[PDB]
Amino acid sequence: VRPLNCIVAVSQNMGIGKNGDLPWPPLRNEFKYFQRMTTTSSVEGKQNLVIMGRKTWFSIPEKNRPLKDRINIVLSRELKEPPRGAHFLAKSLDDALRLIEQPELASKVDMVWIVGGSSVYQEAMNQPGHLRLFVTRIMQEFESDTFFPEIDLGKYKLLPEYPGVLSEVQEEKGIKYKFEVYEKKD
Ligand SMILES: NC(=O)C1=CN([C@@H]2O[C@H](COP(=O)(O)OP(=O)(O)OC[C@H]3O[C@@H](n4cnc5c(N)ncnc54)[C@H](OP(=O)(O)O)[C@@H]3O)[C@@H](O)[C@H]2O)C=CC1
Ligand SMILES: COc1cc(Cc2cnc(N)nc2N)cc(C#CCCCC(=O)O)c1OC
């Protein structure tokens, strides 16, 4: 509940999102991994929590909203009420982070996942604490309108291995990709 786990999928050119959706065609096997990692809590009775920007939320198909079996928090400085389906609405990441650490929530929340928005990824990476970056390396370039922040190898260490994560290269619809995990302890 204290460590922040960012999860993303980026192309070679750090591509992320395009015109409101993903820059590449639907990679259903990649969604499976995103789903398993953000959804699997390490304790029964507790649900993992996902935090995302207002655009990421509405970019997700309505039929897949909210992200089931996960507590959904949306960040927005303009909405006044949580969008239909969302569990909580926060006006800043700080407010979200403080909320999650409340006793009333620490009882039913396990892992915390950051799943959407370039700015959200940025601010999450720009703060003290224990940080982990779960990055899916899409080994191919795609025209993008949004990107992922650079990863400082002097600050983040590439973990040689992580429990539950396979390191072999994968492929779907002719597109190869692999899962990586970086860590910043502070
Ligand atoms: N390749 C991948 O893994 C992923 C790609 N994407 C994609 O990224 C693109 C969208 O990118 P991006 O524009 O960055 O999306 P975001 O979802 O981060 O949209 C930003 C909006 O969200 C809110 N927000 C973000 N940070 C904060 C904060 N600190 N406090 C308050 N509100 C905040 C604001 O809401 P408002 O304007 O309402 O105030 C702001 O305009 C799309 O194509 C999308 O699909 C998304 C997730 C994963
Ligand atoms: C709007 O673009 C998207 C971004 C995301 C976020 C996303 C994808 N991949 C990684 N590695 N990280 C993310 N945060 C997810 C989806 C979707 C879906 C389906 C199944 C979900 C479940 O968990 O139940 C998505 O839609 C396409």
PDB file of C-alpha atoms and ligand atoms in Angstrom:
ATOM      1  CA  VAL A   1       0.000   0.000   0.000  1.00  0.00           C
ATOM      2  CA  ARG A   2       3.052   2.228   0.416  1.00  0.00           C
ATOM      3  CA  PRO A   3       5.147   1.059  -2.595  1.00  0.00           C
ATOM      4  CA  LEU A   4       4.043   2.473  -5.955  1.00  0.00           C
ATOM      5  CA  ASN A   5       3.864   0.024  -8.870  1.00  0.00           C
ATOM      6  CA  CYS A   6       3.680   1.723 -12.277  1.00  0.00           C
ATOM      7  CA  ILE A   7       2.581  -0.564 -15.109  1.00  0.00           C
ATOM      8  CA  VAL A   8       2.783   0.273 -18.789  1.00  0.00           C
ATOM      9  CA  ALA A   9       3.398  -1.006 -22.317  1.00  0.00           C
ATOM     10  CA  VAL A  10       5.604   1.101 -24.594  1.00  0.00           C
ATOM     11  CA  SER A  11       7.013   0.836 -28.106  1.00  0.00           C
ATOM     12  CA  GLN A  12      10.686   1.222 -29.007  1.00  0.00           C
ATOM     13  CA  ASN A  13      10.168   4.965 -29.401  1.00  0.00           C
ATOM     14  CA  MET A  14       8.605   5.094 -25.917  1.00  0.00           C
ATOM     15  CA  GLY A  15       5.259   5.299 -27.662  1.00  0.00           C
ATOM     16  CA  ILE A  16       2.146   5.351 -25.510  1.00  0.00           C
ATOM     17  CA  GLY A  17      -1.376   5.980 -26.786  1.00  0.00           C
ATOM     18  CA  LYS A  18      -2.562   7.497 -30.052  1.00  0.00           C
ATOM     19  CA  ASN A  19      -5.672   9.573 -30.793  1.00  0.00           C
ATOM     20  CA  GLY A  20      -7.340   8.315 -27.623  1.00  0.00           C
ATOM     21  CA  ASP A  21      -6.389   4.655 -27.921  1.00  0.00           C
ATOM     22  CA  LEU A  22      -3.334   2.401 -28.135  1.00  0.00           C
ATOM     23  CA  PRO A  23      -0.960   3.064 -31.086  1.00  0.00           C
ATOM     24  CA  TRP A  24      -0.801  -0.627 -31.913  1.00  0.00           C
ATOM     25  CA  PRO A  25      -3.566  -3.138 -32.752  1.00  0.00           C
ATOM     26  CA  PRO A  26      -5.216  -4.944 -29.806  1.00  0.00           C
ATOM     27  CA  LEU A  27      -2.697  -7.314 -28.175  1.00  0.00           C
ATOM     28  CA  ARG A  28      -5.044  -9.485 -26.153  1.00  0.00           C
ATOM     29  CA  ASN A  29      -2.252 -11.547 -24.623  1.00  0.00           C
ATOM     30  CA  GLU A  30      -0.642  -8.332 -23.368  1.00  0.00           C
ATOM     31  CA  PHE A  31      -3.959  -7.295 -21.755  1.00  0.00           C
ATOM     32  CA  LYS A  32      -3.945 -10.671 -19.976  1.00  0.00           C
ATOM     33  CA  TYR A  33      -0.639  -9.792 -18.265  1.00  0.00           C
ATOM     34  CA  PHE A  34      -1.788  -6.284 -17.355  1.00  0.00           C
ATOM     35  CA  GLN A  35      -4.970  -7.818 -15.951  1.00  0.00           C
ATOM     36  CA  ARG A  36      -3.229 -10.548 -13.931  1.00  0.00           C
ATOM     37  CA  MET A  37      -0.583  -8.266 -12.417  1.00  0.00           C
ATOM     38  CA  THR A  38      -2.896  -5.372 -11.414  1.00  0.00           C
ATOM     39  CA  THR A  39      -5.657  -7.728 -10.269  1.00  0.00           C
ATOM     40  CA  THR A  40      -3.706 -10.353  -8.267  1.00  0.00           C
ATOM     41  CA  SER A  41      -3.399  -9.298  -4.623  1.00  0.00           C
ATOM     42  CA  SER A  42      -0.956 -11.125  -2.367  1.00  0.00           C
ATOM     43  CA  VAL A  43      -3.618 -11.510   0.299  1.00  0.00           C
ATOM     44  CA  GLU A  44      -7.142 -12.913   0.211  1.00  0.00           C
ATOM     45  CA  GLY A  45      -9.791 -10.418   1.289  1.00  0.00           C
ATOM     46  CA  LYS A  46      -7.749  -7.524  -0.057  1.00  0.00           C
ATOM     47  CA  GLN A  47      -8.120  -6.009  -3.522  1.00  0.00           C
ATOM     48  CA  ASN A  48      -5.365  -4.276  -5.458  1.00  0.00           C
ATOM     49  CA  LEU A  49      -5.915  -0.635  -6.250  1.00  0.00           C
ATOM     50  CA  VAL A  50      -5.424   1.103  -9.613  1.00  0.00           C
ATOM     51  CA  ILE A  51      -5.005   4.877 -10.035  1.00  0.00           C
ATOM     52  CA  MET A  52      -5.446   6.515 -13.507  1.00  0.00           C
ATOM     53  CA  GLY A  53      -5.941   9.831 -15.324  1.00  0.00           C
ATOM     54  CA  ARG A  54      -9.372  10.910 -16.583  1.00  0.00           C
ATOM     55  CA  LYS A  55      -8.428  10.303 -20.216  1.00  0.00           C
ATOM     56  CA  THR A  56      -7.191   6.753 -19.621  1.00  0.00           C
ATOM     57  CA  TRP A  57     -10.500   5.931 -17.917  1.00  0.00           C
ATOM     58  CA  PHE A  58     -12.731   7.110 -20.789  1.00  0.00           C
ATOM     59  CA  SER A  59     -10.364   5.582 -23.348  1.00  0.00           C
ATOM     60  CA  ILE A  60     -11.032   2.176 -21.845  1.00  0.00           C
ATOM     61  CA  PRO A  61     -14.021   0.455 -23.540  1.00  0.00           C
ATOM     62  CA  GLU A  62     -17.182   0.995 -21.487  1.00  0.00           C
ATOM     63  CA  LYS A  63     -17.769  -2.751 -21.508  1.00  0.00           C
ATOM     64  CA  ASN A  64     -14.478  -3.115 -19.610  1.00  0.00           C
ATOM     65  CA  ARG A  65     -15.202  -0.272 -17.181  1.00  0.00           C
ATOM     66  CA  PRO A  66     -14.577  -0.302 -14.331  1.00  0.00           C
ATOM     67  CA  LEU A  67     -11.561  -2.608 -14.127  1.00  0.00           C
ATOM     68  CA  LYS A  68     -13.299  -5.467 -12.328  1.00  0.00           C
ATOM     69  CA  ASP A  69     -12.083  -6.906  -9.052  1.00  0.00           C
ATOM     70  CA  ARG A  70      -9.975  -3.790  -8.540  1.00  0.00           C
ATOM     71  CA  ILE A  71     -10.665  -0.592  -6.616  1.00  0.00           C
ATOM     72  CA  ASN A  72     -10.730   2.173  -9.266  1.00  0.00           C
ATOM     73  CA  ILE A  73      -9.511   5.717  -8.543  1.00  0.00           C
ATOM     74  CA  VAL A  74      -9.714   8.391 -11.232  1.00  0.00           C
ATOM     75  CA  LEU A  75      -7.744  11.660 -11.103  1.00  0.00           C
ATOM     76  CA  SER A  76      -9.419  14.797 -12.480  1.00  0.00           C
ATOM     77  CA  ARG A  77      -9.306  18.516 -11.656  1.00  0.00           C
ATOM     78  CA  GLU A  78     -12.629  19.214 -13.420  1.00  0.00           C
ATOM     79  CA  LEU A  79     -15.053  16.394 -12.704  1.00  0.00           C
ATOM     80  CA  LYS A  80     -16.853  16.949  -9.392  1.00  0.00           C
ATOM     81  CA  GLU A  81     -18.374  13.499  -9.035  1.00  0.00           C
ATOM     82  CA  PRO A  82     -16.688  10.152  -9.742  1.00  0.00           C
ATOM     83  CA  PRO A  83     -17.605   9.017 -13.272  1.00  0.00           C
ATOM     84  CA  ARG A  84     -20.155   6.199 -13.418  1.00  0.00           C
ATOM     85  CA  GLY A  85     -18.397   3.015 -12.304  1.00  0.00           C
ATOM     86  CA  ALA A  86     -15.361   4.603 -10.647  1.00  0.00           C
ATOM     87  CA  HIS A  87     -14.942   3.997  -6.898  1.00  0.00           C
ATOM     88  CA  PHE A  88     -13.133   7.211  -5.963  1.00  0.00           C
ATOM     89  CA  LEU A  89     -12.269  10.571  -7.501  1.00  0.00           C
ATOM     90  CA  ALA A  90      -9.131  12.517  -6.454  1.00  0.00           C
ATOM     91  CA  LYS A  91      -8.124  16.045  -7.524  1.00  0.00           C
ATOM     92  CA  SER A  92      -4.404  15.271  -7.268  1.00  0.00           C
ATOM     93  CA  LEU A  93      -2.134  12.264  -6.938  1.00  0.00           C
ATOM     94  CA  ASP A  94      -1.107  13.470  -3.480  1.00  0.00           C
ATOM     95  CA  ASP A  95      -4.727  13.322  -2.348  1.00  0.00           C
ATOM     96  CA  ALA A  96      -5.023   9.834  -3.839  1.00  0.00           C
ATOM     97  CA  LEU A  97      -1.832   8.646  -2.141  1.00  0.00           C
ATOM     98  CA  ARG A  98      -2.965  10.076   1.215  1.00  0.00           C
ATOM     99  CA  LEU A  99      -6.410   8.490   0.849  1.00  0.00           C
ATOM    100  CA  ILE A 100      -5.002   5.039   0.207  1.00  0.00           C
ATOM    101  CA  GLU A 101      -2.946   5.273   3.355  1.00  0.00           C
ATOM    102  CA  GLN A 102      -6.018   5.894   5.543  1.00  0.00           C
ATOM    103  CA  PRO A 103      -6.765   3.182   8.175  1.00  0.00           C
ATOM    104  CA  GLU A 104     -10.246   2.715   6.727  1.00  0.00           C
ATOM    105  CA  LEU A 105      -8.612   1.687   3.432  1.00  0.00           C
ATOM    106  CA  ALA A 106      -5.356   0.049   4.507  1.00  0.00           C
ATOM    107  CA  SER A 107      -7.591  -2.766   5.726  1.00  0.00           C
ATOM    108  CA  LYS A 108      -8.944  -3.692   2.302  1.00  0.00           C
ATOM    109  CA  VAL A 109      -6.173  -2.600  -0.033  1.00  0.00           C
ATOM    110  CA  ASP A 110      -2.979  -4.462  -0.889  1.00  0.00           C
ATOM    111  CA  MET A 111      -0.943  -3.459  -3.945  1.00  0.00           C
ATOM    112  CA  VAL A 112      -1.159  -0.025  -5.538  1.00  0.00           C
ATOM    113  CA  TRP A 113      -0.892   0.246  -9.312  1.00  0.00           C
ATOM    114  CA  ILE A 114      -0.503   3.353 -11.501  1.00  0.00           C
ATOM    115  CA  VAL A 115      -2.028   2.354 -14.872  1.00  0.00           C
ATOM    116  CA  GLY A 116      -2.596   5.381 -17.036  1.00  0.00           C
ATOM    117  CA  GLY A 117      -1.514   8.794 -18.113  1.00  0.00           C
ATOM    118  CA  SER A 118       1.898  10.176 -19.001  1.00  0.00           C
ATOM    119  CA  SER A 119       1.627  12.922 -16.374  1.00  0.00           C
ATOM    120  CA  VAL A 120       0.454  10.415 -13.788  1.00  0.00           C
ATOM    121  CA  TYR A 121       3.485   8.228 -14.544  1.00  0.00           C
ATOM    122  CA  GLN A 122       5.682  11.341 -14.286  1.00  0.00           C
ATOM    123  CA  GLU A 123       4.519  12.545 -10.878  1.00  0.00           C
ATOM    124  CA  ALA A 124       4.487   8.999  -9.547  1.00  0.00           C
ATOM    125  CA  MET A 125       8.145   8.626 -10.618  1.00  0.00           C
ATOM    126  CA  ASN A 126       8.950  12.082  -9.190  1.00  0.00           C
ATOM    127  CA  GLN A 127       8.608  11.342  -5.485  1.00  0.00           C
ATOM    128  CA  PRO A 128      10.305   9.550  -2.551  1.00  0.00           C
ATOM    129  CA  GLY A 129       9.392   6.069  -1.448  1.00  0.00           C
ATOM    130  CA  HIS A 130       9.634   2.563  -2.794  1.00  0.00           C
ATOM    131  CA  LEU A 131       8.926   2.546  -6.555  1.00  0.00           C
ATOM    132  CA  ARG A 132       8.651  -0.319  -9.066  1.00  0.00           C
ATOM    133  CA  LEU A 133       8.248  -0.042 -12.822  1.00  0.00           C
ATOM    134  CA  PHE A 134       6.578  -2.918 -14.657  1.00  0.00           C
ATOM    135  CA  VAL A 135       7.281  -2.166 -18.300  1.00  0.00           C
ATOM    136  CA  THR A 136       6.185  -4.206 -21.321  1.00  0.00           C
ATOM    137  CA  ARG A 137       8.743  -3.600 -24.063  1.00  0.00           C
ATOM    138  CA  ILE A 138       6.896  -3.696 -27.415  1.00  0.00           C
ATOM    139  CA  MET A 139       9.810  -4.391 -29.782  1.00  0.00           C
ATOM    140  CA  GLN A 140       8.453  -2.276 -32.631  1.00  0.00           C
ATOM    141  CA  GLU A 141       7.846   1.367 -33.496  1.00  0.00           C
ATOM    142  CA  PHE A 142       4.340   2.879 -33.683  1.00  0.00           C
ATOM    143  CA  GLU A 143       3.174   6.436 -34.407  1.00  0.00           C
ATOM    144  CA  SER A 144       2.228   7.881 -31.011  1.00  0.00           C
ATOM    145  CA  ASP A 145       0.745  11.071 -29.578  1.00  0.00           C
ATOM    146  CA  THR A 146       1.868  10.374 -25.981  1.00  0.00           C
ATOM    147  CA  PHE A 147       5.007   8.807 -24.417  1.00  0.00           C
ATOM    148  CA  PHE A 148       6.530   7.327 -21.241  1.00  0.00           C
ATOM    149  CA  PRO A 149       9.052   9.255 -19.083  1.00  0.00           C
ATOM    150  CA  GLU A 150      12.714   8.319 -19.392  1.00  0.00           C
ATOM    151  CA  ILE A 151      14.053   5.748 -16.937  1.00  0.00           C
ATOM    152  CA  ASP A 152      17.240   6.720 -15.105  1.00  0.00           C
ATOM    153  CA  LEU A 153      19.347   3.576 -14.781  1.00  0.00           C
ATOM    154  CA  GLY A 154      21.347   5.248 -12.021  1.00  0.00           C
ATOM    155  CA  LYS A 155      18.158   5.603 -10.037  1.00  0.00           C
ATOM    156  CA  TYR A 156      16.251   2.524 -11.214  1.00  0.00           C
ATOM    157  CA  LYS A 157      17.860  -0.923 -11.195  1.00  0.00           C
ATOM    158  CA  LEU A 158      16.717  -3.560 -13.672  1.00  0.00           C
ATOM    159  CA  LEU A 159      15.764  -6.601 -11.609  1.00  0.00           C
ATOM    160  CA  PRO A 160      17.285  -9.776 -13.067  1.00  0.00           C
ATOM    161  CA  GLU A 161      14.039 -11.553 -12.202  1.00  0.00           C
ATOM    162  CA  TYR A 162      10.763 -10.978 -10.345  1.00  0.00           C
ATOM    163  CA  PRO A 163       8.249 -13.496  -8.940  1.00  0.00           C
ATOM    164  CA  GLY A 164       5.387 -14.317 -11.287  1.00  0.00           C
ATOM    165  CA  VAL A 165       7.016 -12.582 -14.235  1.00  0.00           C
ATOM    166  CA  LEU A 166       8.357 -14.537 -17.208  1.00  0.00           C
ATOM    167  CA  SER A 167      11.348 -13.098 -19.006  1.00  0.00           C
ATOM    168  CA  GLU A 168      11.181 -14.954 -22.342  1.00  0.00           C
ATOM    169  CA  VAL A 169      10.318 -12.822 -25.374  1.00  0.00           C
ATOM    170  CA  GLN A 170       6.669 -13.109 -26.444  1.00  0.00           C
ATOM    171  CA  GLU A 171       4.772 -12.485 -29.688  1.00  0.00           C
ATOM    172  CA  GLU A 172       1.203 -11.893 -30.880  1.00  0.00           C
ATOM    173  CA  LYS A 173      -0.094 -10.992 -34.375  1.00  0.00           C
ATOM    174  CA  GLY A 174       3.503 -10.682 -35.510  1.00  0.00           C
ATOM    175  CA  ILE A 175       4.461  -8.246 -32.748  1.00  0.00           C
ATOM    176  CA  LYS A 176       7.206  -9.301 -30.298  1.00  0.00           C
ATOM    177  CA  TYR A 177       7.373  -8.020 -26.704  1.00  0.00           C
ATOM    178  CA  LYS A 178       8.770  -8.786 -23.228  1.00  0.00           C
ATOM    179  CA  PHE A 179       8.135  -7.939 -19.576  1.00  0.00           C
ATOM    180  CA  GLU A 180      10.680  -6.038 -17.464  1.00  0.00           C
ATOM    181  CA  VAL A 181      10.721  -4.826 -13.863  1.00  0.00           C
ATOM    182  CA  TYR A 182      12.793  -1.934 -12.458  1.00  0.00           C
ATOM    183  CA  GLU A 183      13.098  -0.915  -8.799  1.00  0.00           C
ATOM    184  CA  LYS A 184      13.917   2.266  -6.900  1.00  0.00           C
ATOM    185  CA  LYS A 185      14.295   1.775  -3.151  1.00  0.00           C
ATOM    186  CA  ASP A 186      14.488   4.894  -0.990  1.00  0.00           C
TER     187      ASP A 186
HETATM  188  N1  LIG B   1       0.662   2.194 -23.764  1.00  0.00           N
HETATM  189  C1  LIG B   1       0.137   2.077 -22.532  1.00  0.00           C
HETATM  190  O1  LIG B   1       0.391   1.278 -21.643  1.00  0.00           O
HETATM  191  C2  LIG B   1      -0.974   3.071 -22.068  1.00  0.00           C
HETATM  192  C3  LIG B   1      -1.389   4.069 -22.954  1.00  0.00           C
HETATM  193  N2  LIG B   1      -2.454   4.994 -22.445  1.00  0.00           N
HETATM  194  C4  LIG B   1      -2.908   6.118 -23.396  1.00  0.00           C
HETATM  195  O2  LIG B   1      -2.333   7.413 -23.020  1.00  0.00           O
HETATM  196  C5  LIG B   1      -3.145   8.436 -23.791  1.00  0.00           C
HETATM  197  C6  LIG B   1      -3.652   9.429 -22.763  1.00  0.00           C
HETATM  198  O3  LIG B   1      -2.653   9.961 -22.276  1.00  0.00           O
HETATM  199  P1  LIG B   1      -2.716  11.116 -21.126  1.00  0.00           P
HETATM  200  O4  LIG B   1      -3.219  12.312 -21.848  1.00  0.00           O
HETATM  201  O5  LIG B   1      -1.491  11.361 -20.458  1.00  0.00           O
HETATM  202  O6  LIG B   1      -3.753  10.536 -20.097  1.00  0.00           O
HETATM  203  P2  LIG B   1      -4.294  10.680 -18.673  1.00  0.00           P
HETATM  204  O7  LIG B   1      -5.322   9.626 -18.447  1.00  0.00           O
HETATM  205  O8  LIG B   1      -3.225  10.871 -17.691  1.00  0.00           O
HETATM  206  O9  LIG B   1      -5.215  12.126 -18.871  1.00  0.00           O
HETATM  207  C7  LIG B   1      -4.761  13.397 -18.169  1.00  0.00           C
HETATM  208  C8  LIG B   1      -6.005  13.916 -17.441  1.00  0.00           C
HETATM  209  O10 LIG B   1      -6.170  13.247 -16.382  1.00  0.00           O
HETATM  210  C9  LIG B   1      -6.154  13.971 -15.098  1.00  0.00           C
HETATM  211  N3  LIG B   1      -4.927  13.992 -14.298  1.00  0.00           N
HETATM  212  C10 LIG B   1      -3.679  13.444 -14.613  1.00  0.00           C
HETATM  213  N4  LIG B   1      -2.768  13.636 -13.671  1.00  0.00           N
HETATM  214  C11 LIG B   1      -3.539  14.372 -12.716  1.00  0.00           C
HETATM  215  C12 LIG B   1      -3.221  14.979 -11.299  1.00  0.00           C
HETATM  216  N5  LIG B   1      -1.954  14.814 -10.846  1.00  0.00           N
HETATM  217  N6  LIG B   1      -4.240  15.658 -10.588  1.00  0.00           N
HETATM  218  C13 LIG B   1      -5.460  15.732 -11.182  1.00  0.00           C
HETATM  219  N7  LIG B   1      -5.845  15.254 -12.378  1.00  0.00           N
HETATM  220  C14 LIG B   1      -4.812  14.568 -13.100  1.00  0.00           C
HETATM  221  C15 LIG B   1      -6.654  15.286 -15.656  1.00  0.00           C
HETATM  222  O11 LIG B   1      -8.028  15.352 -15.810  1.00  0.00           O
HETATM  223  P3  LIG B   1      -9.140  16.541 -16.340  1.00  0.00           P
HETATM  224  O12 LIG B   1      -8.583  17.096 -17.562  1.00  0.00           O
HETATM  225  O13 LIG B   1     -10.432  15.911 -16.228  1.00  0.00           O
HETATM  226  O14 LIG B   1      -8.828  17.425 -15.116  1.00  0.00           O
HETATM  227  C16 LIG B   1      -5.788  15.421 -16.942  1.00  0.00           C
HETATM  228  O15 LIG B   1      -6.272  16.147 -18.143  1.00  0.00           O
HETATM  229  C17 LIG B   1      -4.225   7.611 -24.598  1.00  0.00           C
HETATM  230  O16 LIG B   1      -3.955   7.176 -25.958  1.00  0.00           O
HETATM  231  C18 LIG B   1      -4.289   6.356 -23.673  1.00  0.00           C
HETATM  232  O17 LIG B   1      -4.859   5.199 -24.244  1.00  0.00           O
HETATM  233  C19 LIG B   1      -3.050   4.929 -21.162  1.00  0.00           C
HETATM  234  C20 LIG B   1      -2.688   3.984 -20.266  1.00  0.00           C
HETATM  235  C21 LIG B   1      -1.604   2.933 -20.585  1.00  0.00           C
HETATM  236  C1  LIG B   2      -7.495   2.647 -23.409  1.00  0.00           C
HETATM  237  O1  LIG B   2      -6.201   1.656 -23.658  1.00  0.00           O
HETATM  238  C2  LIG B   2      -6.082   0.691 -22.652  1.00  0.00           C
HETATM  239  C3  LIG B   2      -5.076   0.830 -21.624  1.00  0.00           C
HETATM  240  C4  LIG B   2      -4.912  -0.138 -20.575  1.00  0.00           C
HETATM  241  C5  LIG B   2      -3.790   0.130 -19.531  1.00  0.00           C
HETATM  242  C6  LIG B   2      -2.513  -0.810 -19.741  1.00  0.00           C
HETATM  243  C7  LIG B   2      -2.197  -1.858 -20.689  1.00  0.00           C
HETATM  244  N1  LIG B   2      -0.995  -2.531 -20.650  1.00  0.00           N
HETATM  245  C8  LIG B   2      -0.040  -2.235 -19.703  1.00  0.00           C
HETATM  246  N2  LIG B   2       1.177  -2.917 -19.655  1.00  0.00           N
HETATM  247  N3  LIG B   2      -0.286  -1.243 -18.780  1.00  0.00           N
HETATM  248  C9  LIG B   2      -1.467  -0.530 -18.761  1.00  0.00           C
HETATM  249  N4  LIG B   2      -1.613   0.471 -17.760  1.00  0.00           N
HETATM  250  C10 LIG B   2      -5.778  -1.299 -20.540  1.00  0.00           C
HETATM  251  C11 LIG B   2      -6.794  -1.452 -21.567  1.00  0.00           C
HETATM  252  C12 LIG B   2      -7.668  -2.648 -21.514  1.00  0.00           C
HETATM  253  C13 LIG B   2      -8.095  -3.748 -21.397  1.00  0.00           C
HETATM  254  C14 LIG B   2      -8.587  -4.860 -21.102  1.00  0.00           C
HETATM  255  C15 LIG B   2      -8.692  -5.747 -20.174  1.00  0.00           C
HETATM  256  C16 LIG B   2      -8.741  -5.446 -18.750  1.00  0.00           C
HETATM  257  C17 LIG B   2      -8.836  -5.880 -17.331  1.00  0.00           C
HETATM  258  O2  LIG B   2      -7.876  -5.763 -16.588  1.00  0.00           O
HETATM  259  O3  LIG B   2      -9.876  -6.361 -16.908  1.00  0.00           O
HETATM  260  C18 LIG B   2      -6.956  -0.471 -22.629  1.00  0.00           C
HETATM  261  O4  LIG B   2      -7.962  -0.670 -23.607  1.00  0.00           O
HETATM  262  C19 LIG B   2      -7.770  -1.034 -25.061  1.00  0.00           C
END
